[PDB]
Amino acid sequence: ILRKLKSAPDQEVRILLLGLDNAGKTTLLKQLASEDISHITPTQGFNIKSVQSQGFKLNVWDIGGQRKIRPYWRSYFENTDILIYVIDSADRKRFEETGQELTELLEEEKLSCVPVLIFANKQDLLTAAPASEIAEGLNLHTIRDRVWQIQSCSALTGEGVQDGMNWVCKNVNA
Amino acid sequence: DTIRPEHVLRLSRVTENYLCKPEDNIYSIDFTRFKIRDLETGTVLFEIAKPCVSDQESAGRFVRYQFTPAFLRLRTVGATVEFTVGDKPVSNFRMIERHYFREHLLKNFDFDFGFCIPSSRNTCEHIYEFPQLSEDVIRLMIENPYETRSDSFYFVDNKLIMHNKADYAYN
Ligand SMILES: Nc1nc2c(ncn2[C@@H]2O[C@H](COP(=O)(O)OP(=O)(O)NP(=O)(O)O)[C@@H](O)[C@H]2O)c(=O)[nH]1
Ligand SMILES: [Mg+2]
């Protein structure tokens, strides 16, 4: 009848969520998956969301950002299609620190040319630094050999998350 | 003994026996949490975690679930597994879960976790749009409780370590 093999592409989209501990990666991922975020604990490992539609798979990886987990980030780099890097916009003491981690990430050869969305998360807070100020601190405008984007967001409310995901969808296959 | 993922993706029906013993789990991988939820409404259909072990009544690694017929008309479902890893390192952890109904492959979930941090606690939610089932398949699946069965194979370095099974009914 209207039964149609519209699918059969066997595609694979890989999104990798990184950032320092307490940035909001797990909260953001569970928000994206419309999931309970009432009792989030520090991720000592990885959280995956594997969303399928008839052979098309979208795999999203949230890796822990504890000091004892960051060294293992390098193990989860292969085949990444988008990098989402989360920054606690209210924790200014750590900007410099997070600024180095991202700098290390964008020099990793395993992640070359992968588009990177920088979520300036926790914009629901009074102390949250604006996204432009963070982009200053990060020297994001010197980023060459890849397309990047910053996005004010609050994983708690959801504000701005769909804008970042719209960018991610627009700049996939890059 | 010598079960590779390739000799498992070619199966056409549930295996008659477990393909490894509980002693084969040399990496002390322990599944600590399981959740089924309807992602269209958000309803958590089933969940069992951490200290809770069973609500019951060869090998102790068999579960079976019953649903109302409405389950077979759901649009998208989300199944979450949470497992811990021990001292020994684990490179290339893989999971192959196959649901059949009498030599009829309904759904294949082949996910390669890869490296697992030692002493880690990880989760994986498979969110799938329910498979395209003809109304004949619905009729048969409803009318024959627990003839829909599933094999859950878990591999480490292409070497089967864990084998759990399940039967599903919709009455
Ligand atoms: N006010 C506010 N709090 C937020 C926001 N996003 C996350 N948080 C909170 O910040 C904390 C960070 O927790 P979490 O989401 O686990 O961050 P994480 O990236 O997973 N850290 P880890 O790498 O250890 O797992 C939590 O208490 C979380 O509720 C936000 O937009 N606003
Ligand atoms: Mg986390």
Residue type, B74: L
| Pairing of the two strands A12-18 and A56-63 | parallel
Give CA B101 to chain center in angstroms. Answer: 15
Residue ranges per domain, chain B?
1-171
Resolution rounded to one decimal, in angstroms: 3.2
- CB of A64 sitting under 6 A from ligand 1: yes
End-to-end Cα distance, chain B? 37
- Pocket perturbation via mutation, ligand 1, pick of A20, A26, A38 by most ligand atoms within 8 A of CB: A26
Q: What are phi and psi of A151, to 5 degrees?
A: -150, 115
∠ CA B33-A19-B90, nearest 5°, is: 45
In sequence order, the 6+-apart residues with CB closer than 8 A to the CB of B81 are B31, B33, B34, B95, B123, B124
- CB of A27 sitting under 6 A from ligand 1: yes
Residue type, B43: T
How was this model experimentally determined? X-ray
Question: Residue A17 CB: number of other CB atoms within 10 A?
Answer: 28
Ligand 2 (ion): residues with CB under 5 Å are: A 25-26, 43
Sheet holding B62-66, edge to edge: B62-66, B159-169, B148-156, B90-101, B105-116
B155 close to B93: Cβ distance less than 8 angstroms: yes
Chain B residues within 8 Å of chain A (Cβ atoms)? 39, 42, 78, 85, 109, 111, 113-117, 119-129, 132
- Pocket perturbation via mutation, ligand 1, pick of A17, A18, A21, A22 by most ligand atoms within 8 A of CB: A22
Asked whether the beta carbons of residue B117 and residue A44 sit closer than 8 angstroms, the reply is yes
Residue with tokens 């984007």: A149
Distance CA B135, CA B137 (A): 5
Q: B146 labelled as ligand-binding?
A: no
Distance CA B165, CA B151 (A): 5
3-state secondary structure of A166: helix
Question: Residue A168 CB: number of other CB atoms within 10 A?
Answer: 20
| Tokens, residue A63 | 């890796």
Cα Rg of chain A, angstroms: 16
Residue with tokens 């959280």: A47
Distance CA B49, CA B31 (A): 9
| Pairing of the two strands B62-66 and A148-152 | unpaired
| Tokens, residue A152 | 């004010």
DSSP-assigned letters across all residues of B81-135: EEEE--SS-EEEEEEEEEEEESS-EEEEEEEEEEEE-TT-EEEEEEEEEPP---H
